[PDB]
Structure 1
Amino acid sequence: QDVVNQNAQALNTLVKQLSSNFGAISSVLNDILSRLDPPEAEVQIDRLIT
């Protein structure tokens, strides 16, 4: 059971990490993409990427 539990916990943490701003103004790419021009969206997308 420990194997299954640890794998599930790791997967859950990894997939939950998708909902953090990391400093950017959003947590979903499409928002920043439709809300900003590229010459500015570059830095935000870069923060999210790192």
Structure 2
Amino acid sequence: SKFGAISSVLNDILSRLDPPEAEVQIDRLITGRLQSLQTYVTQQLIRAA
């Protein structure tokens, strides 16, 4: 999922954009991916309980 950025694949976005404008999009990717991981870990905790 692009998560509202240019692309959903880091190894392309890092080479298509320079750092001082790419950090925003990579931060969007980080926040989306980590929110998804938080959802996954919470659901796993509930299932484990």
The TM-score, its normalising length taken from structure 1, stands at: 0.60
The one of 25, 31, 34 equivalent to 1:44 is 25
User: Structure 1 runs of 4+ off > 3 angstroms?
Assistant: none
Which secondary structure does the structure 2 equivalent of 1:45 belong to?
Answer: helix
Partner of 1:29: 10
Residue ranges of structure 2 left out of the alignment (5+ in a row): 32-49
Q: Please give the per-residue CA displacement for 1:8-48, whole angstroms capped at 9, x wherever unaligned.
A: xxxxxxxxxxxx00101001101110100000000000000
> Percentage identity across aligned positions?
97
What is the number of residues matched between the two proteins? 31
Residue ranges of structure 1 left out of the alignment (5+ in a row): 1-19
The TM-score, its normalising length taken from structure 2, stands at: 0.61
Which secondary structure does the structure 2 equivalent of 1:22 belong to?
Answer: coil
Which has the larger Rg?
1
Partner of 1:3: none
